[PDB]
Design a protein around this ligand. Structure first.
Ligand SMILES: O=C(Nc1cncc2ccccc12)[C@@H]1CN(S(=O)(=O)CC2CCOCC2)Cc2ccc(Cl)cc21
Ligand SMILES: O=C(Nc1cncc2ccccc12)[C@@H]1CN(S(=O)(=O)CC2CCOCC2)Cc2ccc(Cl)cc21
Ligand SMILES: [Cl-]
Lengths: 297, 305
């Protein structure tokens, strides 16, 4: 029993975190094999700024050891620093680009030292509601599948509303953001419908059934209602993805959609679901299945 | 900016997790130097759990009855002893991944990270608090026994909890790393229930100061209160009494934000009376009590917005 916001064990990622200094700027880098990956803003015409730098201008520190930079190149908004030593702690890994609604673990670092781990989701407006201070740039997002670390995010900046923006590990931003000081704002955000439904199934599994009702709905009628509460549209793919949870609890996806519709129109009425007075949207269907089954890494 | 429930990086603890098998029971152990620490109920059957005599069960065991597995390697048990409700298995190999560590016993209201494991393999990490009724609201399934709670302030791992059991309400009970239970619980299948739980007042106050640091002040008011009047109101909402120690502990946050502890107490009294009225504080519609004053100082900036 119990339902927590759970992150992946961070050990395989901790052994990759390094500190990168260029002039007055200090941030975090990801050391995999003989390459250190970090935001290109550590150095705007970034090719003109980069051409003026030499390998020795980049100071890379792995723990108490100084790593020697032997080359450098830029890929989109990510700088790749070729180092003379391969990371002996390099895990099995892939660089993956995630979609809005998907969740991941963030290892927040300052000065190449990991300070915390938390779980979060890529919002529909491509921002993340993270917890970051100055010096956190270069901190990474990841998932783990068996023994393979899938790196999906690298932190670049904070938006005026306090939310965060970054890139995949190939340097492509999530969202219409650019790496520079200019007027940028997060777009209007929406609730991840498929994730709220998964969390309602997790509440049923944990013995919370007060919100269930005898009713059902069509996908069209549910989507007409959901659009009015700034909820993301629910697709047939989402319905198919929720199939296992529907079979386990005995509540059809459109039966659970009718429960969600009543919660949106009437509220919780002084009640909570899994210790929350709000509808939670940062657990995917796979997160619910994994936490209510005990998958290990 | 931002405020998340943040756990410590778990790597130093992952390198200590092992699987312990005794007969038909399999659970987790903590391998530090040449000792594996695990719940003593690993020597029990489900039948034994009603009224087990651990001393009588242990005397019948030999070292080779305990199977310890660290990854794909079988460790050899060369000794065993019981200390309160934990079993200490002496092994022939010291853990090369042993971090700098201490065993610390925590008080209710304190927070810690939990590395949930099954079969000696870490599956997840989450943050939680020792409730005033000495239980923890964790996320654990069968096979999670032996999973540990810890803090990593600086580079030293402070082990404070080892998971032993789930109570009927879905809440969890366990021991410090010396085998002493938190709360009036026994590692017995006897009728035991968690006492009525209360809200950790000092932690809700710390979280309200974190909201002020992050730029939110809608809940503040022009009033103050005496400590006694605040406690008379707080007890009516099942909130823990606020002591002078708690007031002293909140001093730094009071100095940083410019809001006196008893003025913040007046805001809390008003939130308890009125609710949030469709508003949230740090993305929450409930008053959060699982961030200590120390957690707020650690996570939040030193400059108020
Ligand atoms: O965002 C950036 N850093 C950060 C990143 N994360 C969390 C932070 C928290 C607090 C302060 C910085 C943070 C940097 C630095 N800044 S900055 O103007 O100094 C910081 C602003 C950010 C918005 O809130 C007000 C303060 C300009 C900048 C421009 C472009 C790029 Cl790509 C990065 C960056
Ligand atoms: O608690 C224990 N294990 C667990 C531990 N943690 C989380 C669990 C979740 C699910 C199942 C077991 C869990 C064990 C075994 N059990 S048990 O009967 O399997 C537990 C009940 C709790 C209510 O839900 C049904 C199962 C009795 C027992 C008695 C004393 C002691 Cl010290 C340990 C233990
Ligand atoms: Cl303590």
């Amino acid at each position: 029993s119990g339902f927590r916001k759970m992150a992946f064990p961070s050990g395989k990622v901790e052994g990759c975190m390094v500190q990168v200094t260029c002039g007055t700027t200090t941030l975090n880098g990801l050391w995999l094999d003989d390459v250190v990956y970090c935001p290109r803003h550590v150095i705007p015409n970034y090719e003109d700024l980069l051409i003026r730098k030499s390998n020795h201008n980049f100071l890379v520190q792995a723990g108490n050891v100084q790593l020697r930079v032997i080359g450098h190149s830029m890929q989109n908004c990510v700088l790749k620093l070729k180092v003379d030593t391969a990371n002996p702690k390099t895990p099995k890994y892939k660089f993956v680009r995630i979609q809005p609604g998907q969740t991941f673990s963030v290892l927040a670092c300052y000065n190449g030292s990991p300070s915390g781990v938390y779980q979060c989701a890529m919002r529909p407006n491509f921002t993340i509601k993270g917890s970051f201070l100055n010096g956190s740039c270069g901190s990474v997002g990841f998932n783990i599948d068996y023994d393979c670390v899938s790196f999906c995010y690298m932190h670049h900046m904070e938006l005026p509303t306090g939310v965060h923006a970054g890139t995949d590990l190939e340097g492509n931003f999530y969202g219409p953001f650019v790496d520079r000081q200019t007027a940028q704002a997060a777009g209007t955000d929406t609730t991840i419908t498929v994730n709220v439904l998964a969390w309602l199934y997790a509440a049923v599994i944990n013995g919370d059934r007060w919100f269930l009702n005898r009713f059902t709905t069509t996908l069209n009628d549910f989507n007409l209602v959901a659009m009015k509460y700034n909820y993301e549209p629910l697709t047939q793919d989402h319905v198919d993805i929720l199939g296992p949870l529907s079979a386990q609890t005995g509540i059809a996806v459109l039966d659970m959609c009718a429960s969600l519709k009543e919660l949106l129109q009437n509220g919780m009425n002084g009640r909570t679901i899994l210790g929350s007075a709000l509808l939670e949207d940062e657990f995917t269907p796979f997160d619910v299945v994994r936490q209510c089954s005990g998958v290990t890494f």
